[PDB]
Design a protein around this nucleic acid. Structure first.
Ligand SMILES: [Mg+2]
Ligand SMILES: [Mg+2]
Length: 132
RNA sequence: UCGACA
DNA sequence: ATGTCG
């Protein structure tokens, strides 16, 4: 049932909106494959979205067909739509995350991928392996 | 009016 | 508490 041969991604924050980071781990081993430097202001869902898209890019650049697990129904939908429907205000503090989101959407519109993006089933399996 | 995912 | 979708 759990596809162990996969990349798991999650967001961590302090505040929401607040300081946002995300990371990607090997679901089997728990090895940390990428971790993004904290972004001073963002939302949980923005970070969950950026983590997926970072994973797609990471896997694509490495010619890997592994799926990606996320526990975020929001982010999964945003990635599918190629569109992050965040409510976060736009100002000088949120400019960085909003630039990163814009660039993520732009990646999705300029690349193909066959990577299945799967929902991690927290209720049945416990916390996703990339959890902070 | 909630339900659900975080 | 907030950020999001069904
Ligand atoms: Mg999560
Ligand atoms: Mg989590």
């Amino acid at each position: 049932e759990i596809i162990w041969e996969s990349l798991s991604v999650d967001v961590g924050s302090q505040g929401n909106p607040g300081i946002v980071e995300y990371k990607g781990v090997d679901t089997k081993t728990g090895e940390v494959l990428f971790e993004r430097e904290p972004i001073p202001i963002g939302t949980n869902n923005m970070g969950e979205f950026l983590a997926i898209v970072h994973g797609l890019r990471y896997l694509k650049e490495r010619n890997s067909r592994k799926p990606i697990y996320s526990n975020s129904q929001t982010a999964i939908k945003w990635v599918k739509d190629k569109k992050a429907k965040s409510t976060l205000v736009r100002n000088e503090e949120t400019a960085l995350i909003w630039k990163l989101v814009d660039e993520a959407e732009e990646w999705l519109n300029t690349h193909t991928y066959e990577t299945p993006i799967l929902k991690w089933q927290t209720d049945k399996w416990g916390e996703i392996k990339a959890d902070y």
